[PDB]
Design a protein around this ligand. Structure first.
Ligand SMILES: [Mg+2]
Ligand SMILES: [Mg+2]
Ligand SMILES: [Mg+2]
Length: 536
């Protein structure tokens, strides 16, 4: 039986991540100074008599510098008190910032704060077009809308057109901040990526900058980077010992891109165990996906699928030799997870991630069947299968495995496919289909999302892409609404789902697959997050 020959690119990275040896003198020096810098910062936040605008700017800056995770409780109290005071600044800049920060933290502040900035038709007063700081903060706020927020329906276009017009004549680094915002809004970016751009390209170059906060942010970023490098090295060794790069040469070699995805889901050190477990799943499921998409035949794929459903080390013998490799690796990985979680008494939650994996495999196989039969389903039927093949239900469930505070009840809410999770899954699916359409159509994938959408509604490739765009925008409103209090689970368990959607926006920016073409999209981010430290 002849196979299709491998056309995926080898790893850009070689061995450069395989061993990282932390300099503990540096590490312990950084940590000792950070503690002093941390407390000076706490006292800035707890300073009394601050005006509203200065308080929001302080919180905003600490968040953009990537250090707010040290002050979750302090920032919460301050925003809560601001929420309940329901103050009214007449400043567009302060109003838009107040709106965004509160909404991003779950406080359902009313969009009527923007009415004083609009005319009769609820269109923004064009006299505000010369207030660049107002437009910037309005622009960032325009991305955290829910469905109750149509008063803001004009904010994105209004702020965009005038930021575009003003940008070339702005001073630095404001000009670079505005230009970056137009390319990547804050709310939908990956946090470490935006933090690193803000520290090095913006705050470092601000004459007004606060030296305590800047030094804090540089040391903390570089200190956390040392941890991430340890994790990546330990994950690179685990991947090396598996050796699929030689035994399964059809498969993509992308463990570093997978680690970046895990790092976008959470970066804080308390999630180190959760991150390592997560990368291993993303890597492993990536292999299954290449098996289905570029190597196995119908009968091997059926035996693989059924073996996955039965999930028993008695079943290896039914698979061809190449499938025995991954199948045992999959089963081992999950026994590893169960052992990893035993000392905390949390081994019993691994079954939830396993059930989601079985679901992904079932739907991979359906997708193969559709490709072989030349079947083009209607959109609703396409989605019923293709949403799970994003892997995003699986990854979200996986993301909880290493989170020591995640309980059985948390997994039960997630098993019911809650609305915030569905929207994140929908964002991944429709953005991916828009970006991968023309290429996987060239490979004859008759059942690709845009195709189903054209055939179903009888519309052009362009009208189908616009329909998929609106599905993404609807999903972002649902994500944003799913973060508002009272939340159905702790916000700690919502942020990974939000971050999975951010990963989508960052990976397919301006519409190229970035995990399969990592050198265009993901390579600069991996260098900036995992190779180069921030120059102090
Ligand atoms: Mg695929
Ligand atoms: Mg596939
Ligand atoms: Mg695709």
């Amino acid at each position: 039986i002849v196979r299709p020959v491998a056309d995926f690119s080898p790893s850009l990275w070689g061995d450069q991540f395989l061993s990282f040896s932390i300099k503990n003198q540096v590490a312990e020096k950084y940590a000792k100074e950070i503690e002093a810098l941390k407390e000076q910062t706490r006292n800035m936040l707890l300073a009394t008599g601050m005006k509203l605008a200065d308080t929001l700017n302080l919180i905003d800056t600490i968040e953009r510098l990537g250090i707010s995770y040290h002050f979750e409780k302090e920032i919460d109290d301050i925003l809560d008190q601001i929420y309940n005071q329901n103050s009214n600044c007449n400043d567009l800049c302060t109003s838009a910032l107040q709106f965004r920060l509160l909404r991003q933290h779950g406080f359902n502040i009313s969009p009527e704060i923007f009415s004083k900035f609009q005319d009769e038709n609820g269109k923004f007063k064009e006299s505000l077009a010369s207030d660049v700081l107002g437009l910037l903060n309005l622009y960032e706020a325009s991305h955290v809308r829910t469905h109750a927020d149509d008063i803001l329906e004009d904010a994105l276009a209004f702020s965009t057109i005038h930021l575009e017009s003003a940008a070339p004549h702005l001073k630095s680094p404001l000009r670079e901040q505005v230009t970056h915002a137009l390319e990547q809004c804050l709310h939908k970016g990956v946090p470490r990526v935006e933090t690193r751009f803000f520290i090095s390209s913006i705050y470092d170059k601000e004459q007004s900058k606060n030296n305590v906060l800047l030094r804090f942010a540089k040391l903390d970023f570089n200190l956390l980077q040392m941890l991430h490098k340890q994790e990546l090295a330990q994950v690179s060794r685990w991947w090396k010992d598996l050796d699929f790069v030689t035994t399964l040469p059809y498969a993509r070699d992308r463990v570093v891109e997978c680690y970046f995805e895990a790092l976008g889901v959470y970066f804080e050190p308390q999630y180190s165990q959760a991150r390592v477990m997560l990368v291993k799943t993303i890597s492993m499921i990536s292999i299954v996906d290449d098996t289905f998409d570029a190597y196995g035949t119908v009968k091997e794929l059926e035996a693989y699928t059924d073996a996955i459903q039965r999930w028993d080390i008695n079943e290896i013998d039914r698979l061809p030799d190449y499938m025995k490799i991954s199948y045992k690796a999959i089963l081992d990985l999950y026994k590893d997870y169960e052992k990893e979680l035993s000392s905390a008494g949390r081994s019993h939650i691994v079954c939830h991630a396993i059930e989601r994996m079985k679901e992904v495999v079932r739907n991979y196989n359906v997708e193969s069947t559709w490709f072989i039969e030349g079947y083009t389903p209607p959109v609703s039927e396409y989605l019923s299968n293709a949403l799970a093949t994003t892997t995003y239900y699986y990854l979200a469930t996986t993301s909880y495995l290493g989170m020591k505070s995640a309980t059985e009840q948390d997994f039960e809410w997630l098993s019911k496919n809650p609305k915030i999770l569905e929207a994140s899954v929908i964002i991944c699916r429709v953005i991916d289909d828009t970006a991968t359409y023309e290429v996987e159509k060239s490979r004859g994938q008759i059942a690709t999302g845009i195709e189903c959408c054209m055939r179903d509604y009888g519309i052009s490739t362009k009208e189908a892409m616009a329909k998929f765009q609106n599905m993404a925008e609807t999903a972002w409103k649902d994500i944003n609404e799913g973060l508002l209090r009272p939340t159905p689970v702790s916000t700690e368990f919502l942020t990974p789902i939000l971050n999975l959607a951010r990963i989508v926006e960052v990976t397919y920016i301006h519409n190229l697959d970035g995990y399969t073409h990592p050198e265009k999209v993901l390579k600069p981010h991996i260098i900036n997050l995992l190779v180069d430290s921030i120059k102090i």
